[PDB]
């Protein structure tokens, strides 16, 4: 009955508690299979950790784990690409509730498959089967698309920015809880039992969506699935329609959103893997503080977003948000000490106030009956951003490690010079 915000909380808790556990099991099984009994992290760096000599077997197991994560993520992304673009456009024609019930069920099934693989110490290729099965029903991306569309169907033009911000603040709060609860359950007496919370969270999400969610499509027509008009419903969303030159703005905004979330996704990973480097050498608690402060920008940019709107338009708010990201990443990439790193986290407090604005403006452009299609395409873009961010940034960091550590953050900050320019050029051009 109440609303859709709890669904995203419960669904993001699943990802946050799932990805580290899944890769930890990958480490365990792949290492033990190759006769390697050592730490299940990557190679360390500095602070008297060894001699610097390469660990040929540890590097082999690390590469195998990365390759398997790549395989399962890529397979999941393709099945999700072919599924969400068919389940979104349909959602805006039958109701948001079924298209939110289905992916939660898929995630519960995926968590159950993962549990069954861990308890039986099964092969690691079988983890691909669970991800593929969940992808068919629409992955976590379809949950995101359904939630965002459901919000965009219950808010004016002059409110979608704030409503989307509220939803993404719930997303960030779920992420922070997942990360800081994993940092104490996964680490302490964990890696198997904490995965029960993933199944519990997904079961709760499905139950809340089915029996406690109130649909937002005020008129749900009757439409058949496997129609081909849900794939045509994004081609005749981006290419032919909207003829009053509102077609360029869609592409430019989509590109800006792509770049923005790519950088966000890459920099989170490099945060966690770079905090414990050579000149910083952070303890176990300081890393938890860093993760909490990284995920606290979600709910602290919301306060500014609502506060900034009273004086500046909905674009310049995102311009200042991008400036805050740029400043934070620049001062993090030069953070050769822990006061500097924490200041770097602190400056990024209006950091994730830009993404909400972008998707809200994307929604304000499409008709009232096409938010399903729009957010299906945006969810596909976000999945591709996940993949590319992981690949590019995890390949960049080791290369610029003995040359200038922190160039990943510097280059991420150079990337956001493009979204800021794009959004500013669009906003300047409307007014003239």
């Amino acid at each position: 009955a109440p609303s859709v915000e709890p669904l995203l909380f419960l669904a993001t808790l699943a990802l946050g508690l799932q990805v580290p556990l899944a890769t930890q099991y990958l480490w365990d099984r792949l290492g033990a299979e190759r006769g390697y009994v050592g730490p299940n992290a990557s190679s360390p760096h500095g602070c008297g950790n060894g001699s610097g000599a390469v660990d040929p077997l540890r590097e082999e197991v690390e590469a195998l784990v990365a390759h398997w994560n790549l395989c399962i993520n890529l397979g999941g992304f393709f099945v999700g690409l072919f599924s969400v673009t068919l389940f979104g456009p349909w959602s805006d024609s039958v109701g948001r509730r079924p298209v939110l019930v289905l992916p939660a069920v898929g995630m519960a099934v995926q968590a159950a498959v993962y549990l069954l693989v861990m308890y039986l110490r099964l092969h690691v290729a079988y983890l691909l089967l669970g991800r593929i099965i969940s992808g068919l029903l629409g992955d976590y991306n379809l949950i995101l698309a359904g939630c965002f569309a459901s919000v965009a169907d219950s808010s004016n033009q002059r409110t979608r920015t704030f409503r989307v911000a509220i939803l993404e603040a719930c997303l960030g709060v779920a992420g922070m809880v997942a990360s800081v609860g994993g940092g104490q359950w996964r680490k302490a007496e964990g890696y198997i039992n904490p995965f029960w919370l993933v199944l519990a969270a997904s079961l709760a999400a499905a139950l809340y969506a089915a029996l406690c969610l109130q649909e937002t499509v005020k008129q749900r027509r009757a439409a058949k699935l496997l129609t081909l008009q849900h794939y045509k419903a994004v081609y005749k969303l981006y290419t032919a329609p909207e003829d009053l030159s509102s077609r360029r703005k869609l592409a430019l905004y989509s590109l800006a959103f792509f770049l923005l979330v790519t950088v966000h996704f890459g920099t989170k990973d490099l945060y966690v893997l770079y905090e414990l480097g050579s000149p910083l050498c952070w303890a176990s608690d300081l890393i938890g503080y860093g993760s909490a402060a990284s995920y606290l920008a979600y709910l602290s940019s919301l306060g500014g977003l609502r506060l900034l709107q009273l004086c500046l338009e909905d674009t310049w708010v995102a311009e200042i948000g991008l400036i805050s990201n740029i400043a934070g990443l620049v001062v993090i990439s030069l953070a050769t000490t822990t006061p500097l790193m924490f200041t770097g986290y602190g400056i990024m407090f209006l950091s994730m106030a830009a993404t909400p604005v972008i998707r809200a403006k994307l929604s304000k452009l499409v008709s009232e009956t096409e938010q399903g299609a729009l957010f299906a395409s945006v969810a596909c873009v976000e999945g591709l951003c996940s993949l590319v961010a992981t690949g590019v940034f995890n390949s960049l960091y080791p290369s610029t490690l003995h040359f200038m550590r922190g160039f990943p953050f510097l280059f991420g900050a150079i990337l956001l010079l493009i979204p800021a320019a794009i959004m500013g050029w669009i906003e300047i051009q409307d007014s003239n």
Partner: nanobody, 117 residues
Framework: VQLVESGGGLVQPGGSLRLSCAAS????????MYWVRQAPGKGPEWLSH????????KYTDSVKGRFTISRDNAKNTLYLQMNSLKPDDTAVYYCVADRRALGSPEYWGQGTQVTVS
């Protein structure tokens, strides 16, 4: 945080060297404990490891049935006795300490010299 080891030395082939890892600076009841060596002119050769309790003991087949890890948490020392030592064993044995998690640091010990001959 510091881990200090003292069991090395010049022992004959077939001796019974007994390393201790007198750890402190942290809890040690919540930390996985490893062992590793850097043979002369070569790379790390991870030997064994043991979960915070003493139930998940794993070895490597080069040292299976010949190295016997142990820990005593009321004293905070990690052992690894070495029966039937061989000239291929001489190395600098380190004593790692991880939480068995990705976002956790590992604390390499100083490591002592075993000079089997």
């Amino acid at each position: 945080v510091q881990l200090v080891e003292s069991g090395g030395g010049l022992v004959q082939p077939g001796g019974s060297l007994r390393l201790s890892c007198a750890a402190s600076g942290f809890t040690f009841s919540r930390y996985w404990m490893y062992w590793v060596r850097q043979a002369p002119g070569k790379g790390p050769e991870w030997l064994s490891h043991m979960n915070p309790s003493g139930s998940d003991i794993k070895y490597t087949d080069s040292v299976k049935g010949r190295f016997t890890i142990s820990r005593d948490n009321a004293k905070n020392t990690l052992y690894l006795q070495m029966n039937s030592l061989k000239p291929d064993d001489t190395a600098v044995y380190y004593c790692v300490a991880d939480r068995r998690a990705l976002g956790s640091p590992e604390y390499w010990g100083q490591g002592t010299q075993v000079t089997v001959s």
